[PDB]
Amino acid sequence: WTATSGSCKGRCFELQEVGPPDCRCDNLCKSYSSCCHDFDELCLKTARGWECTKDRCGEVRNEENACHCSEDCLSRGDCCTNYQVVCKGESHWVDDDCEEIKVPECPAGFVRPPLIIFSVDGFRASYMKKGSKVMPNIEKLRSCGTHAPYMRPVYPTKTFPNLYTLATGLYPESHGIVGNSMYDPVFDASFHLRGREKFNHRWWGGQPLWITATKQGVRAGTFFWSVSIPHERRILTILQWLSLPDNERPSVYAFYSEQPDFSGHKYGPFGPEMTNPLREIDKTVGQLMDGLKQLRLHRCVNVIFVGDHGMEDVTCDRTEFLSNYLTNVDDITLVPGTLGRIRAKSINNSKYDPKTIIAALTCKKPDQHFKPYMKQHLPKRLHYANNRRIEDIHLLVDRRWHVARKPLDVYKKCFFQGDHGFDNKVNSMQTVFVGYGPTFKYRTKVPPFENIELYNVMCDLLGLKPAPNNGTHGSLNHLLRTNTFRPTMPDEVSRPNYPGIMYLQSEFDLGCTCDDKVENKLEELNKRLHTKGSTKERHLLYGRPAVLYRTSYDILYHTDFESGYSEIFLMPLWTSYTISKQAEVSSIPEHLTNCVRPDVRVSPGFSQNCLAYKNDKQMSYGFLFPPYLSSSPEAKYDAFLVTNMVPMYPAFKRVWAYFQRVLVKKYASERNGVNVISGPIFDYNYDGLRDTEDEIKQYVEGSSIPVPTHYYSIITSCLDFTQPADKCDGPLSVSSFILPHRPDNDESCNSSEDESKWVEELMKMHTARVRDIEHLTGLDFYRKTSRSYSEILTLKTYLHTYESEI
Numbered sequence: 001w002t003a004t005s006g007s008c009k010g011r012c013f014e015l016q017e018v019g020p021p022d023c024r025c026d027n028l029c030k031s032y033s034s035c036c037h038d039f040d041e042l043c044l045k046t047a048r049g050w051e052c053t054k055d056r057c058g059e060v061r062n063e064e065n066a067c068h069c070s071e072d073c074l075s076r077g078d079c080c081t082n083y084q085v086v087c088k089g090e091s092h093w094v095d096d097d098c099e100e101i102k103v104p105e106c107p108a109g110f111v112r113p114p115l116i117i118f119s120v121d122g123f124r125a126s127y128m129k130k131g132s133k134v135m136p137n138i139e140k141l142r143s144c145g146t147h148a149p150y151m152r153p154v155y156p157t158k159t160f161p162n163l164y165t166l167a168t169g170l171y172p173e174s175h176g177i178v179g180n181s182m183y184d185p186v187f188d189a190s191f192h193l194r195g196r197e198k199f200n201h202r203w204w205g206g207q208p209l210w211i212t213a214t215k216q217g218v219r220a221g222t223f224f225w226s227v228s229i230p231h232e233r234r235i236l237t238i239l240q241w242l243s244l245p246d247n248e249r250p251s252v253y254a255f256y257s258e259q260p261d262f263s264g265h266k267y268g269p270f271g272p273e274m275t276n277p278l279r280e281i282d283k284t285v286g287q288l289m290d291g292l293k294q295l296r297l298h299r300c301v302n303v304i305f306v307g308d309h310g311m312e313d314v315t316c317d318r319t320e321f322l323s324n325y326l327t328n329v330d331d332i333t334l335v336p337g338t339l340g341r342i343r344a345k346s347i348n349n350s351k352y353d354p355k356t357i358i359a360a361l362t363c364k365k366p367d368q369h370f371k372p373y374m375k376q377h378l379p380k381r382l383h384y385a386n387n388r389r390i391e392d393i394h395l396l397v398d399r400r401w402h403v404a405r406k407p408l409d410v411y412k413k414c415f416f417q418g419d420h421g422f423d424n425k426v427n428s429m430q431t432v433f434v435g436y437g438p439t440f441k442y443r444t445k446v447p448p449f450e451n452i453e454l455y456n457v458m459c460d461l462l463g464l465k466p467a468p469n470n471g472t473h474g475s476l477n478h479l480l481r482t483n484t485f486r487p488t489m490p491d492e493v494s495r496p497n498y499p500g501i502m503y504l505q506s507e508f509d510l511g512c513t514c515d516d517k518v519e520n521k522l523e524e525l526n527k528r529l530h531t532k533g534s535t536k537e538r539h540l541l542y543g544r545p546a547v548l549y550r551t552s553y554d555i556l557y558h559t560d561f562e563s564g565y566s567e568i569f570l571m572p573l574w575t576s577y578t579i580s581k582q583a584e585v586s587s588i589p590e591h592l593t594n595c596v597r598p599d600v601r602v603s604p605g606f607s608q609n610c611l612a613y614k615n616d617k618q619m620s621y622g623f624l625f626p627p628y629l630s631s632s633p634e635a636k637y638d639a640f641l642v643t644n645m646v647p648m649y650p651a652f653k654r655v656w657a658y659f660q661r662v663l664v665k666k667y668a669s670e671r672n673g674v675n676v677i678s679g680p681i682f683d684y685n686y687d688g689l690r691d692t693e694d695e696i697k698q699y700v701e702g703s704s705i706p707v708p709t710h711y712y713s714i715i716t717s718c719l720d721f722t723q724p725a726d727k728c729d730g731p732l733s734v735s736s737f738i739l740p741h742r743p744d745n746d747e748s749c750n751s752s753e754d755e756s757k758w759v760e761e762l763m764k765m766h767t768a769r770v771r772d773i774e775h776l777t778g779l780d781f782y783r784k785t786s787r788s789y790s791e792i793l794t795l796k797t798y799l800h801t802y803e804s805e806i
């Protein structure tokens with residue numbers, strides 16, 4: 001109940017929320033049906049429109065007007081945004097040349113430049129160029145401030161997951177808003193767009209910017225605007241808030257536009273009807289900037305123009321129906337659309353089997369426009385698994401398509417021409433970023449980055465300490481003129497051992513054999529130096545990774561590669577090697593096909609053994625430094641050391657072998673040498689973070705040899721590819737992947753064909769940031785380069801997406 005008998009007199013858009021049943025006057029009351037009787041009358045005035053006209057100038061203050069052109073309006077802070085242009089001969093902000101804002105130019109009593117976030121729903125990245133003619137205000141912001149060609153949203157590329165990611169710096173899996181629709185089995189409760197349950201605090205995890213500000217004494221305008229409140233009114237309210245007394249005035253503000261998303265759903269991303277909503281957004285930006293200029297705040301405030309996601313073409317006829325695949329269609333609940341989430345309709349149904357559901361959806365039709373996954377097998381880059389609200393079964397839907405349960409669900413629930421929600425690597429889903437203000441750089445283009453990074457920066461902009469989040473703090477320092485955050489490299493927790501030769505061949509009983517018994521200080525003084533690390537400068541280019549957790553490991557040196565070998569996990573945590581453009585691919589000699597050799601630097605008790613692999617009918621093995629890339633017949637024997645061995649399903653060996661035999665050389669050719677760091681990943685609880693030994697759910701049979709869930713590689717070269725990887729004088733270029741270590745190739749529908757038709761495509765799907773690999777391994781890469789740490793942080797957040805140009 002709300003006793004709405006009180007009044008909004010003088011309380012219009014009050015910054016503090018009074019406790020019911022007292023009537024409210026804040027910009028959220030509409031969505032609660034708790035506004036005072038007079039809210040519309042007093043707080044939502046519309047009389048006379050939004051602009052001053054020539055004959056309104058100098059008028060007598062008439063309180064019924066939506067905004068004012070009277071003389072006292074500046075002091076009252078409630079002029080129409082175009083007042084000075086019409087009545088005082090001022091020019092529009094857009095018509096002014098831009099001038100570098102070297103320092104905040106703020107009125108007395110402003111303790112810090114305010115931050116205004118102007119967020120636009122469905123603003124596809126390519127609108128910046130494609131709509132440039134009809135958006136002069138946005139275009140000045142863009143070219144005069146700091147801009148990226150695009151900003152990468154989070155998966156799923158829906159509104160609430162993305163806006164809440166912007167506000168928290170967290171992946172949906174951590175903030176909890178994992179879709180526009182959700183079921184939480186622990187609450188036994190459902191979250192919906194329409195409805196009231198979504199206003200319950202328990203859905204919303206992490207700590208959004210407005211709470212971070214508030215707890216640290218920085219006042220915030222409210223972020224959520226009711227749909228019925230017109231854009232012009234939202235602008236004037238922000239401007240009014242900015243005219244408040246120093247002690248009452250917020251420092252951070254948000255504006256939100258439902259457009260161009262709203263129109264985009266109806267008309268498609270480039271429907272002719274899209275021009276108008278883009279003009280209108282630009283007009284709103286103009287009004288904000290004119291209002292700021294009126295208040296002498298246009299060289300004081302930092303403005304962020306940011307979208308949540310793009311928009312793709314999607315029509316009713318491009319819909320896959322689960323009823324064309326499943327006989328048991330009525331025993332499942334589907335969260336439908338641009339992604340699919342499946343669970344059992346009833347928990348009392350013990351005949352529901354996810355395994356057989358997945359099988360029935362796997363490569364069943366030639367051009368099938370969705371792919372089923374168990375959530376832990378989704379590409380790690382999506383970070384979409386560690387939350388009880390994410391169903392075990394997931395469908396990644398092809399761009400331009402929908403998935404639905406039954407045809408009736410489509411024609412009884414074509415309407416739409418656009419939608420979004422797809423994989424966050426899809427060009428059509430990319431959105432925008434522009435920063436303009438004293439704290440951002442002048443006329444600067446920055447590389448694309450992820451929206452998870454913005455929280456940190458908005459914290460920097462407001463002098464706040466960010467709550468723990470998924471951004472990498474410092475990776476966006478190159479956006480900022482000042483207020484940079486100077487991060488320091490994490491301290492190494494474990495130091496390596498450096499074992500020499502300590503064991504005789506005969507101390508090993510591993511059931512391994514090798515045809516290697518063939519024999520001179522020419523080639524023996526030489527091989528000593530290689531095992532002490534004489535070629536280490538070539539194969540270990542950026543210093544050894546640091547181990548950021550407590551463990552026992554050995555640095556092992558070799559002619560062709562260096563490794564950090566875990567005595568705990570019985571394999572390298574990392575294997576580093578350099579392949580020059582000139583390097584040659586050889587095959588494995590017939591006599592050495594099954595060759596595995598004990599490593600005399602490492603005890604039998606800390607080694608794998610061949611027997612376990614013989615007994616395990618499911619599990620074979622591969623090597624991290626590839627035998628094919630050995631520098632010499634003699635060097636090749638090193639690649640067969642038991643300490644270079646890792647467990648691999650035969651199905652995965654097809655993938656790995658093609659990577660090592662074909663792709664590494666190809667990348668070396670194309671990139672002028674590559675440095676490769678490869679290794680295992682263990683993430684059995686799919687939390688994106690390195691497993692402790694007690695979290696491993698699978699071993700090679702009859703052994704303590706743990707089975708990785710994934711294999712990674714980080715592939716680094718010179719950004720200036722006219723320089724070789726091993727002699728680079730400037731910025732680096734990287735591409736990485738985290739390949740799932742699976743017993744089958746069910747994910748690849750073409751896998752019965754040659755590796756040259758499917759493997760690289762799989763790898764591309766599982767592209768990763770070095771930073772993702774850091775979370776998963778507890779290692780820290782690039783410790784010793786000539787590059788600034790901030791640039792390295794940027795490099796570590798880079799994702800090679802394999803899409804076309806935007």
Ligand SMILES: *[C@@H]1O[C@H](CO)[C@@H](O[C@@H]2O[C@H](CO)[C@@H](O[C@@H]3O[C@H](CO[C@H]4O[C@H](CO)[C@@H](O)[C@H](O[C@H]5O[C@H](CO)[C@@H](O)[C@H](O)[C@@H]5O[C@H]5O[C@H](CO)[C@@H](O)[C@H](O)[C@@H]5O)[C@@H]4O)[C@@H](O)[C@H](O[C@H]4O[C@H](CO)[C@@H](O)[C@H](O)[C@@H]4O[C@H]4O[C@H](CO)[C@@H](O)[C@H](O)[C@@H]4O)[C@@H]3O)[C@H](O)[C@H]2NC(C)=O)[C@H](O)[C@H]1NC(C)=O
Nearest residue numbers: 173174175176204205206386387388468469470687688775
């Ligand atoms: C992206 O960034 C985020 C933020 O940094 C990273 O997430 C953090 O990871 C930490 C490590 O996993 C984790 O720390 C744990 O916190 C536990 C208490 O956490 C509560 O309090 C915090 C602070 O206010 C709060 O943020 C948490 O909020 C979570 O849960 C609520 C309610 O469920 C949600 O509203 C909210 O959205 C959030 O949910 C998410 O996180 C939880 C895990 O906390 C997931 O389960 C969800 O799926 C969802 O993703 C909490 O309210 C604390 O109890 C933990 O301590 C246990 O483990 C340590 C190991 O060191 C051990 O020493 C302790 O003894 C203890 O073990 C006991 O519990 C075990 C399990 O129940 C049991 O087995 C043992 O026997 C013991 O009894 C731990 O310290 C931190 O909470 C999250 N923070 C957030 C916001 O998610 C994330 O990792 C980053 N991602 C990547 C890829 O880098």
Ligand SMILES: Cc1cc(OC(F)(F)F)ccc1COC(=O)N1CCn2nc(C(=O)N3CCc4[nH]nnc4C3)cc2C1
Nearest residue numbers: 117119121163166167223224225227254255256258261262
């Ligand atoms: C939470 C945050 C952080 C920001 O930025 C940051 F945190 F990054 F700083 C910015 C804004 C915000 C919040 O934004 C808002 O004010 N609202 C949240 C989004 N929202 N959606 C609606 C809605 O009902 N629909 C509009 C879209 C649409 N299209 N078709 N149908 C619909 C139906 C109303 C609102 C109000």
Ligand SMILES: [Ca+2]
Nearest residue numbers: 121122159308
């Ligand atoms: Ca949206």
Ligand SMILES: [Ca+2]
Nearest residue numbers: 683689690691
């Ligand atoms: Ca884990």
Ligand SMILES: [Cl-]
Nearest residue numbers: 158179180181
């Ligand atoms: Cl969803």
Ligand SMILES: [K+]
Nearest residue numbers: 613616619620
């Ligand atoms: K085997």
Ligand code: NA
Nearest residue numbers: 745746748751
């Ligand atoms: Na297959």
Ligand SMILES: [Zn+2]
Nearest residue numbers: 122261265420
């Ligand atoms: Zn939408």
